[PDB]
Amino acid sequence: VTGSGKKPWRQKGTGRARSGSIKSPIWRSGGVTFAARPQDHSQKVNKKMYRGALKSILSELVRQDRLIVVEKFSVEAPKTKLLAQKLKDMALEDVLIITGELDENLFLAARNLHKVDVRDATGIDPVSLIAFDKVVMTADAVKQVEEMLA
Amino acid sequence: METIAKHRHARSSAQKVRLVADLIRGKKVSQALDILTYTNKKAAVLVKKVLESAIANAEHNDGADIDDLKVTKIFVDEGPSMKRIMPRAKGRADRILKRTSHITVVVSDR
């Protein structure tokens, strides 16, 4: 805190409480006993535990058939409205859609649809699998994941 | 009709203004004016001006007819107080509060 380190007033004599530094947490302006610092909240998560979780997650998405796997999935042009329709026809609003190799148009559509995202095979993270109401995934991606998790 | 008037931030304590107010609470307006008129206190002149302002209000703004008109409700709340400094001696400081008061007169007829 900004101030000098001068003792505010005599130890003894004034009828006053002891007082030592004008920056004392007990005093008003200036203090904070245990001022925080920038800090790192990154946890570890074992390799085998991460994989262990994805499996428990997939193997639950089927069990609620929230995972619908498809041979090929792609939109014909970089236009959101197209994708909006595909989903409409497929009976879907909230979707993860993990594509095999990922293409330009499928990504630019959905960039603006809020409840729908599209990831490549490597981009699969745990919260998302649970996040969306339905995970699509091309049968091509399935084989990728099949191995990634061993 | 209640029809009230008042003096805000008057220079007097309240403790002082009350005492003059208390003489008037409930009288026919007619009497109060005489009472105030022969009451040797600065707060009397203050309270008078308020009472008078109240009558003229009651007169010009609502019904009027001062003759049937009584000071039915009168009080003074203590206002904000002006802090000053003077010093009594050695280097010591004395607050001294120049206290103020909010005089209020309600002059109706029922």
């Binding site: 004599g13 004034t14 | 050695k90 280097g91």
Partner: peptide
């Protein structure tokens, strides 16, 4: 500061 009696020795020392 301090009142004069507190500073003054004769009144303050009083019982040694």
């Amino acid at each position: 500061t301090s009142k004069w009696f507190n500073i003054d020795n004769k009144i303050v020392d009083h019982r040694p």
